[PDB]
Amino acid sequence: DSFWEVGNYKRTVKRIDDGHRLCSDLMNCLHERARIEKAYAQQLTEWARRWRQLVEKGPQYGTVEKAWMAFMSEAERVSELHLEVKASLMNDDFEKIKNWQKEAFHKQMMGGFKETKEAEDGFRKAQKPWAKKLKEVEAAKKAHHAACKEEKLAISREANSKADPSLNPEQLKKLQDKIEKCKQDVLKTKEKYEKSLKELDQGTPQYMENMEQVFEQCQQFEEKRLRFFREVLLEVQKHLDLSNVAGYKAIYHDLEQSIRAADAVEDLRWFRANHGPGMAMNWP
Amino acid sequence: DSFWEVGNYKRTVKRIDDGHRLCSDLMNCLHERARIEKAYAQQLTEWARRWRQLVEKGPQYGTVEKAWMAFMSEAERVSELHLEVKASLMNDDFEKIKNWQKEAFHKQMMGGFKETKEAEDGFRKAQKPWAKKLKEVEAAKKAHHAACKEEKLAISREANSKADPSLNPEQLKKLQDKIEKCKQDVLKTKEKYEKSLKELDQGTPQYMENMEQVFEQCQQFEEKRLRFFREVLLEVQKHLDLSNVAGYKAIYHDLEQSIRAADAVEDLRWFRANHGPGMAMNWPQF
Ligand SMILES: [Ca+2]
Ligand SMILES: [Ca+2]
């Protein structure tokens, strides 16, 4: 139930297998994000190339045709931005974790992680002396718990056979022979059965110190990882961050200007000269 | 090829049908943009849900578990903003163009549009006066070229008949008059050809005046469409713009602070107390 109970250091021992687990999960978490960002960028440039072409082949010409293209252009600037969001998540963040994992966890041959294995052995050693004494102590209490269960059997047995009618010449003595024999046990077994509980307590302050020394080490190894995680997530939020960006705002004040540059009357002047009454005519 | 040659005004008339198409094209262009916005927003939320589950059912607990989770949140917050872009494009800009195209163009029962048909007729009535005249000159150029063609024929024929001897005496008077009428036609048809040439130049000034009045009418209609596109495009640029949004900065406002709220020392202190030496023990007794 508790850490100090034999073999319960395991909960923290498992805590490092998970460390390697979570590194991979964090890596995939980000990996899927990058993938999502890339798709939005693929869809962006396709829509842009699709419609840049459709507008150019279409009937729209002149200055309004331009404002419209500025539109596809923004789909392309926005595409390049999310393309870099992805590039950053994979080239910087993802890799940073992949490399930390390789430096913090070393897959063994048999085999698990050289690190989890070392925590196991360190705990096992700390407990070893204490578990053996418990091994002795548990024999102490259980043997006597059968020794006391063995005084009561004859005390309530004798008065029971005392009321009995027959055979009291020598059969009397044996009745008084096997209740007092159990008397030497309850004193002899208990005497040592509670002596082991002594030795255990002498060899207890060390066991507690040899288990906090292994533990604080496991803690130190987790602390490094936790700090890493917080540090990396900080850099990730910065790579996803598009709320306050220079290049981003340029995309949109450029767009606005380009559309504002659209001159309806200018475009009309052009159509009059090149397809209308402005055209030259060879009069008979 | 020039606009002034008959039936060439059709280029500007064709412009009216094209205006209607372009309204449809812009409509479709924006729709596919809005659908892209939706797909991205959607992916972002499929993702957020998937990983909120995985981190919660996973081994990671404490403040770091949270910093990691405020992360699925930012994906959900970004997602919503792009659904806003999608919404604005379809509810405002798409509907806007859709309605304008319904009050600018009316579909005749027979075909085409009321405005396309209206302009074409306007160009015919403006041209008919001059069209009938060019038709007359068009013949004069031919009949005269036929008279000059037939003329050099008769002369060549008497000249080709200059060396060739009899027969005959009566055959000549025939080949003698053939030429006279020919030298007559070139002086006659030339007269009619000259007459129509000037007969047109007196009906030509009134031809351009009417052609212009119909043209400005088409410009008047094209101007509204062109000015409208400018208007709508500015409204889309505004809707597409996420580079300066309060609700957007706020996302990383809270992400950064939810991440910085992470604390290794605290998480470890919780673990030892709840899973380690901090735990009290049922120390053995008699
Ligand atoms: Ca074009
Ligand atoms: Ca969890």
Side-chain angles (χ1 to χ4, degrees), chain A residues 1-192 194-284, chain B residues 1-285:
Chain A
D1 36 278
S2 168
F3 169 78
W4 297 105
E5 218 193 37
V6 145
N8 274 17
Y9 56 68
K10 66 169 170 181
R11 197 140 217 153
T12 97
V13 157
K14 186 209 171 201
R15 213 252 270 85
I16 148 176
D17 286 336
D18 296 333
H20 176 95
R21 174 176 175 318
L22 298 154
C23 280
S24 307
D25 273 343
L26 216 206
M27 275 185 275
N28 288 143
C29 181
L30 301 185
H31 197 275
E32 268 146 52
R33 192 65 157 89
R35 212 179 316 147
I36 295 178
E37 293 292 309
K38 188 189 55 261
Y40 180 53
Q42 179 77 238
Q43 268 187 327
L44 275 174
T45 65
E46 257 151 44
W47 175 82
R49 105 173 186 193
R50 200 215 176 216
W51 276 100
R52 169 174 276 114
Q53 190 196 160
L54 283 165
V55 180
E56 279 167 350
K57 272 204 160 192
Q60 250 296 153
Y61 291 108
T63 216
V64 167
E65 182 196 5
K66 268 165 194 154
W68 199 337
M69 312 297 191
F71 217 85
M72 277 86 273
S73 289
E74 80 90 27
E76 269 145 9
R77 299 321 147 217
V78 167
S79 177
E80 278 144 28
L81 260 161
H82 294 268
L83 209 274
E84 188 61 22
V85 176
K86 179 228 157 204
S88 300
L89 292 174
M90 295 297 300
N91 291 342
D92 300 342
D93 305 341
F94 178 87
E95 295 296 338
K96 185 170 172 177
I97 300 169
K98 168 189 285 179
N99 287 353
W100 190 89
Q101 192 183 49
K102 293 178 178 293
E103 299 282 315
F105 307 88
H106 317 277
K107 302 190 171 81
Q108 273 189 342
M109 235 311 303
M110 225 69 272
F113 293 114
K114 156 185 153 63
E115 11 285 340
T116 79
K117 182 89 198 76
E118 268 163 11
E120 186 97 58
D121 300 351
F123 276 130
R124 233 159 203 160
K125 256 231 291 170
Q127 270 194 2
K128 192 195 185 61
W130 191 83
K132 216 178 202 176
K133 275 340 231 67
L134 209 187
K135 270 296 223 66
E136 266 108 69
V137 156
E138 208 59 16
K141 266 190 51 278
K142 111 174 204 191
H144 143 217
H145 271 56
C148 273
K149 204 271 207 303
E150 224 56 19
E151 256 194 19
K152 202 251 199 162
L153 96 308
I155 273 195
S156 52
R157 134 114 278 180
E158 220 223 13
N160 261 39
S161 97
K162 190 78 76 175
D164 283 320
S166 318
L167 303 190
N168 334 330
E170 276 264 303
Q171 334 283 39
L172 202 310
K173 86 177 193 66
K174 47 150 142 283
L175 292 167
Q176 266 197 243
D177 294 328
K178 200 196 172 192
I179 2 78
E180 198 280 339
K181 253 274 164 282
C182 299
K183 198 57 261 178
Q184 270 149 334
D185 295 1
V186 159
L187 157 140
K188 140 92 137 35
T189 91
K190 151 196 269 51
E191 137 207 286
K192 295 188 176 185
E194 279 184 348
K195 141 56 35 64
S196 61
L197 323 203
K198 287 261 211 167
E199 302 171 308
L200 158 150
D201 263 284
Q202 275 173 112
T204 258
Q206 192 70 161
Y207 155 90
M208 300 213 315
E209 158 175 321
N210 292 341
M211 289 274 295
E212 289 216 34
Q213 207 272 312
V214 171
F215 178 83
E216 250 298 303
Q217 214 51 38
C218 282
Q219 288 290 235
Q220 219 65 198
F221 177 56
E222 185 73 358
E223 191 190 3
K224 267 108 83 188
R225 179 190 144 265
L226 286 182
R227 283 194 141 75
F228 178 80
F229 264 51
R230 163 191 150 98
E231 171 196 343
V232 162
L233 282 169
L234 273 188
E235 281 157 332
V236 172
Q237 85 93 196
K238 219 172 312 159
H239 293 134
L240 293 175
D241 199 339
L242 296 190
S243 48
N244 196 46
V245 198
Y248 199 19
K249 290 162 203 201
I251 299 182
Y252 288 92
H253 81 231
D254 274 24
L255 208 202
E256 190 204 350
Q257 321 263 55
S258 303
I259 308 184
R260 301 249 27 175
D263 196 342
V265 170
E266 201 291 334
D267 281 355
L268 289 183
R269 296 180 174 333
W270 178 90
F271 191 90
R272 181 178 194 272
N274 295 16
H275 293 295
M279 295 191 70
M281 171 62 171
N282 286 333
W283 311 95
Chain B
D1 157 53
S2 161
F3 162 77
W4 295 103
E5 330 225 35
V6 329
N8 277 358
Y9 60 85
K10 69 174 189 168
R11 172 83 289 282
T12 77
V13 176
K14 177 55 177 169
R15 202 231 269 105
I16 310 181
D17 299 325
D18 288 341
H20 164 94
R21 150 164 141 110
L22 296 169
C23 297
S24 294
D25 284 343
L26 186 53
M27 265 187 283
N28 281 133
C29 168
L30 299 188
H31 186 225
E32 309 185 352
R33 186 65 171 75
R35 286 167 66 190
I36 281 160
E37 290 299 295
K38 208 279 195 62
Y40 176 60
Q42 208 179 204
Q43 272 191 302
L44 266 274
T45 30
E46 323 274 24
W47 182 80
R49 198 210 167 175
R50 184 198 159 159
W51 278 110
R52 186 176 263 118
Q53 189 95 130
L54 289 251
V55 187
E56 278 172 347
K57 312 297 180 51
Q60 188 56 26
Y61 293 98
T63 80
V64 170
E65 179 201 21
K66 274 162 190 164
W68 187 348
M69 217 75 54
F71 204 121
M72 291 72 207
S73 275
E74 78 85 45
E76 272 159 3
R77 290 302 197 78
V78 161
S79 165
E80 200 202 333
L81 270 170
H82 287 265
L83 277 180
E84 254 194 298
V85 179
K86 181 226 151 208
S88 290
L89 293 173
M90 295 308 305
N91 295 347
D92 286 329
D93 303 328
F94 183 82
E95 280 301 303
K96 178 149 195 173
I97 317 175
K98 194 205 186 190
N99 280 58
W100 184 94
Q101 172 206 61
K102 220 141 55 183
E103 260 146 324
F105 306 85
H106 325 313
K107 346 200 85 156
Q108 273 190 349
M109 290 276 289
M110 287 311 184
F113 300 87
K114 175 203 182 182
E115 24 284 316
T116 265
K117 176 88 176 196
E118 196 159 1
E120 187 130 35
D121 300 351
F123 275 120
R124 255 98 104 154
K125 158 158 143 63
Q127 208 178 49
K128 209 176 83 169
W130 152 293
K132 89 188 309 173
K133 247 50 204 317
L134 207 287
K135 217 49 175 174
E136 314 182 9
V137 165
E138 215 57 296
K141 164 193 280 195
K142 164 209 268 283
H144 194 265
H145 282 45
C148 292
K149 227 99 75 192
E150 193 93 331
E151 181 260 33
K152 213 188 187 193
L153 167 274
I155 279 189
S156 294
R157 260 35 206 172
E158 159 151 293
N160 291 12
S161 185
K162 86 183 192 177
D164 54 21
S166 79
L167 293 184
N168 35 134
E170 191 64 1
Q171 170 80 250
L172 184 145
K173 191 55 146 44
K174 223 81 181 304
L175 292 254
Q176 198 179 193
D177 289 343
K178 265 201 165 190
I179 171 270
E180 182 54 10
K181 276 319 223 325
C182 283
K183 203 171 173 72
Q184 269 257 111
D185 292 340
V186 172
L187 219 175
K188 92 105 324 81
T189 309
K190 220 258 267 188
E191 223 305 68
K192 273 150 73 175
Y193 182 82
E194 309 280 279
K195 215 216 327 181
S196 287
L197 263 256
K198 243 290 200 283
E199 217 178 42
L200 249 183
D201 271 79
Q202 321 217 292
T204 180
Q206 178 67 149
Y207 167 66
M208 303 180 307
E209 171 172 287
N210 287 23
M211 224 62 186
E212 213 85 64
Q213 279 163 187
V214 185
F215 184 73
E216 193 61 23
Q217 226 58 38
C218 295
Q219 295 291 241
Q220 230 71 258
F221 191 84
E222 175 67 2
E223 194 180 14
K224 288 165 186 302
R225 207 203 94 243
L226 285 182
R227 290 220 137 107
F228 173 73
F229 271 53
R230 201 215 188 212
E231 160 151 36
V232 160
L233 283 167
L234 283 183
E235 274 156 355
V236 201
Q237 169 267 324
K238 174 204 156 208
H239 293 323
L240 295 180
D241 206 347
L242 297 181
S243 63
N244 197 218
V245 165
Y248 191 43
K249 319 157 190 164
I251 289 171
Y252 305 90
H253 196 102
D254 298 72
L255 215 201
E256 181 183 14
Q257 64 189 197
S258 290
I259 293 186
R260 270 179 167 159
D263 193 345
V265 174
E266 223 311 315
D267 291 5
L268 300 178
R269 282 182 161 268
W270 173 91
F271 186 86
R272 75 85 62 33
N274 303 31
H275 282 299
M279 279 177 153
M281 171 62 179
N282 273 175
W283 296 116
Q285 288 193 314

